[PDB]
């Protein structure tokens, strides 16, 4: 896979930001927006495959994405725990 | 607390009264020719 | 595979509270997330005290110093006074 | 108000004066000057 | 006359304790230590007399708000107020002292009510009625009377006439503030900041007694510019609606968002098990 | 100009439905973790986690930003109200 | 009253409760009156909650609670909130709030 | 007691945030949010103290407080 | 010779980041931490060490809480930090509601 | 009572000859050390706890290393272990 | 001793019963304490090492608080890792 981050179109963003109450949004933030996503990401899924591959799985589950979140304060309900 | 509601609802009764009431004597207080500088006061 | 939920639980304290209302299957997912969850911090809490005091036992007062660091005041307040009535009907009885 | 400018060996006041649109902060019932839209201002001097 | 009071403003930095007497038109606050620290009060230019007794404060206080501000050393001043502080078997001879001074001042106030030939109502607060509020930079007690809403312990003092009120806005709505607004719309609005939420609905009930209409929001108003666009056309203002900000009826067409049709379906297990005997080992 | 924006506004807070689409999104997330480790597998539910948490985190952070702009007497969000908002939330 | 919830009149099983203390290595010896403390706190906990719930979907005119019902009852109680400001719901949504 | 806070010393703590200019009602906020900050740390401490059925504050207390809040102090025992 | 408004200011705060030494008086704060204290349990004991953390942890709070308070107002493009500023931090921090 | 005090004095010999500490910089290290001991301990207990083991080896310290520090840290610092633990193990 | 067989400083004993003692597992492998102190060793050293570049810069030859906080808070990845902590008589870094 390349390059697929504009895959989060910028009608997107405008969607996340009205639902944020933001009103009028300048273009830049867009690609702004696009990398601090990216850097969250690989944040959490970097711990979500360190939890994978010490189970010894290949596959990754919900409860390592869980713990990845919970580890960061990030904890979520509705997917177990 | 029916009771008490329904005193509530004189309460508000009171108040779209006193809104309304407010509301009249704006209009009476100024004049269309008040605006437009009433009684002279044409910028001494 | 028998997987432990606490789903039932929540039915029965739901029609307790609201005999006719109704939980979807995520809000019983959710409910139990929060349930797994706070057992987890009130645990651990309870743990760092009996270490931090050097004991080995968990007793009911490592419990209720942690819903009074938990919780907040009116919360703790009315969660204490549940746990302690329920403590001691279970001990009279 | 004025404004006073050290330029060289001189000195420079410039004074202004009230006009309409560049006006102070008195209300509109007492004005400065009297009223009229055919009255042109003198709205600034630069001395030197 | 009235011996041994305080006066406030104070006429010279030194604070000195003065005679208050009763002339035919007016007052004279006069200082033992020099003659030339009178202050003169005509009865005509008093617009409200409190009396305010020693009960549960330190001082018993006798305050003249006035129509035209007075000259009192280097301030202008409206509100010219006569203090003395009770601050000295104990308990029960400062009981006897305050019951003294509060009988002394009373009597006083009365005697300036009297000799203004019915000019003058001497007004009491009514302590019972009272609410907590910041008015300017402290917590004070606000303390309604008769005809206005004041406080008089702490310096800067809060005289709020209830009849020259036009609106109260009460903001944050949602600790709440209020907001008076006044009938001269050249006068700036006066805030009460930090008021108890627990007396929100006294505070609705005492202004609607009071015959003031009042508005409710969520939101702080910049009234220095509401005020001065209500200035610049007052008749403009009243022509589209006012106050009771109506707005312009639906300002969107309603979308709705409640349609009374249950989703998530979901199986009502009800007593179901996936349980039963949950092993419960009895250790301890 | 405005009052779309604002009915769109209320739309879309009266409502829970994920925003960002679910196939960009999962070939976004797969990209990422071919970095890791070479030929992953994913849970369905782990995407969609990892969907909700991000909306979650973004819409925090738009709120963040919107409360920047305001306080810079504006309604124009912008990078360095972003850049503000990570900064104090201690974000690197 | 055979099993120990009968005997403290709680509805979550203390018996549950008691294995996961002992087999969940937190300390080498566990109360008689922990568990049912905790019960009945997690009890207490969950009635708060499920009544606030109950009430914002009768606001909103439905039978069933919902990821939103419990969102709205999170973020609209002061105490529940700031207990909970660190969770995420999903299909929660958000506040109006404008 | 509150007023022990001086604003020389609400100056001198802004000054070593690098803060340039000051308005008035600074002291008064930074007053009221130290008194939160102490209320809640304090509760959490005097909580420790009672459980260990003490009547004396300790160091451990303090610590073990401020690791609850999240903000890890070291050099005091921990 | 006369100084500039603020001239005298960056002396301090060189001077003030370079120290470490505390910058509230120890009574006072024990006399604060003390009068909080007696609205939980009255006869309360405080060893001289809990006074000292507790003074380190709040300098240190406070001085973090005044660098975001000062990046808000430079944001804002100022120089005066108000007490807007500090509830915006705040707020952005987590902590206000 | 015990501490840390007198390994942290060999190690800064070991790096720095020529350089002293101070009591309260040898306070503040020994809570370091307790503090970094309690968060590996604590990662690994819930990651023995996820998998379902009864034992804490040298697997779970590593993989909390890895969780725990930044890339070239917790690189340096599995490199270190692991060579420890292969001279350890190597000899007997 | 345990330290010595593997070419270690800190105790291997201590940290195996302190990690028994510990209410963290039911047993505790003996790989585990070996690469934890040498994990802890490892940091303590760079750590160690920063704080007399420090003190050195100050013309210093004994470490204090100061060199410590400025050693965390100069290194990118320490003062990540050391995001939360307050170090009593650390300072703050010269920023203007």
Avoid at chain 1, 34 to 55: C, M, Q, S
Avoid at chain 5, 114 to 124: F, M, P, Q, R, V
Avoid at chain 5, 141 to 146: D, G, K, N
Avoid at chain 6, 3 to 13: D, G, P, S
Wanted: charged content about 30%; proline content about 4%; glycine content about 6%.
């Amino acid at each position: 896979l390349r390059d697929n981050i504009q895959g989060i179109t910028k009608p997107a963003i405008r969607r996340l930001a009205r639902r944020g109450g933001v009103k009028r949004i300048s273009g830049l933030i867009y690609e702004e927006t696009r990398g601090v996503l990216k850097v969250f990401l690989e944040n959490v899924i970097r711990d979500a495959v360190t939890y994978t591959e010490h189970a010894k799985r290949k596959t990754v589950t919900a409860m390592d994405v869980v713990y990845a979140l919970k580890r960061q304060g990030r904890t979520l309900y509705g997917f177990g725990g | 607390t029916n009771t008490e509601e329904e005193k509530e609802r004189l309460r508000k009764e009171i108040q779209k009264q006193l809104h309304e009431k407010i509301q009249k004597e704006g209009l009476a207080r100024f004049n269309k020719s008040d605006a437009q500088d009433g009684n002279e006061n044409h910028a001494v | 595979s028998r997987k432990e939920s606490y789903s039932i639980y929540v039915y029965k304290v739901l029609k307790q509270v609201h005999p006719d209302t109704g939980i979807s299957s995520k809000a019983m997912g959710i409910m139990n997330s929060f349930v797994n969850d706070i057992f987890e911090r009130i645990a651990g809490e309870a743990s760092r005290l009996a270490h931090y005091n050097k004991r080995s036992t968990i007793t009911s007062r490592e419990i209720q110093t942690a819903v009074r660091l938990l919780l907040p005041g009116e919360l703790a307040k009315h969660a204490v006074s549940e746990g302690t009535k329920a403590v001691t009907k279970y001990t009279s009885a | 108000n004025g404004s006073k400018n050290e330029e060289g060996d001189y000195m420079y006041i410039r004074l202004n004066f009230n006009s309409p649109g560049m006006g102070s902060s008195v209300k509109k019932t007492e004005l400065p000057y009297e009223d009229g839209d055919d009255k042109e201002f003198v709205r600034s001097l630069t001395f030197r | 006359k009235l011996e041994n009071v305080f006066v406030r403003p104070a006429p010279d930095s030194k604070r000195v304790t003065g005679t208050l007497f009763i002339h035919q038109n007016g007052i004279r606050y006069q200082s033992p230590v020099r003659s030339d620290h009178r202050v003169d009060i005509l009865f005509s230019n008093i617009k409200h007399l409190f009396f305010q007794p020693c009960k549960e404060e330190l001082m018993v206080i006798i305050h003249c708000h006035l129509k035209t501000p007075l000259m009192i050393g280097k301030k202008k001043t409206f509100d010219v107020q006569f203090y003395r502080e009770v601050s000295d078997e104990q308990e029960q001879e400062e009981r006897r002292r305050k019951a003294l001074l509060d009988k002394e001042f009373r009597r006083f106030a009365e005697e300036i009510s009297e000799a203004s030939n019915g000019l003058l109502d001497l007004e009491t607060p009514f302590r019972e009625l009272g609410f907590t509020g910041v008015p300017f930079r402290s917590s004070v007690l606000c303390l309604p009377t008769r005809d206005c809403l004041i406080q008089l312990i702490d310096t800067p003092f809060l005289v709020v006439t209830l009849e020259e009120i036009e609106v109260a806005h009460l903001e944050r709505v949602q600790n709440f503030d209020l907001v008076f607004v006044f009938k001269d719309f050249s006068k700036p609005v006066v805030h009460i900041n930090t008021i108890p939420i627990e007396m929100l609905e006294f505070v609705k009930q005492w202004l609607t007694d009071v015959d003031i209409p009042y508005s409710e929001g969520a939101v702080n108003l910049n009234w220095g510019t509401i005020m001065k666009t209500i200035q610049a056309d007052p008749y403009e203002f009243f022509e589209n609606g006012g106050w009771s900000f109506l707005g312009g009826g639906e300002s969107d067409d309603e979308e709705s968002e409640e349609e009374e049709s249950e989703f998530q379906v979901s199986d009502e297990d009800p007593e179901d098990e996936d349980v039963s005997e949950e092993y419960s080992a009895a250790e301890d | 100009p405005g009052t779309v924006a604002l009915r769109e506004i209320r739309r879309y807070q009266k409502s829970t439905e994920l925003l960002i689409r679910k196939l960009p999104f999962q070939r976004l997330v797969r990209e990422i973790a071919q970095d890791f480790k070479t030929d992953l597998r994913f849970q369905s539910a782990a995407i969609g986690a990892l969907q909700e948490a991000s909306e979650a985190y973004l819409v925090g952070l738009f709120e963040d930003t919107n409360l920047c702009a305001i306080h810079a007497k504006r309604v124009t969000i912008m990078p360095k109200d972003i850049q503000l908002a990570r900064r104090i939330r201690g974000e690197r | 009253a055979k099993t120990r919830s009968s005997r403290a009149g709680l509805q979550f099983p203390v018996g549950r409760v008691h294995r996961l203390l002992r087999k969940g290595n937190y300390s080498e010896r566990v109360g008689a009156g922990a568990p049912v403390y905790l019960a009945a706190v997690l009890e207490y906990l969950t009635a708060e909650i499920l009544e606030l719930a109950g009430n914002a979907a009768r606001d909103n005119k439905k039978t069933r609670i919902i990821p939103r019902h419990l969102q709205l009852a999170i973020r609209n109680d002061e105490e529940l909130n700031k207990l909970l400001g660190r969770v995420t719901i999903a299909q929660g949504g958000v506040l109006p709030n404008i």
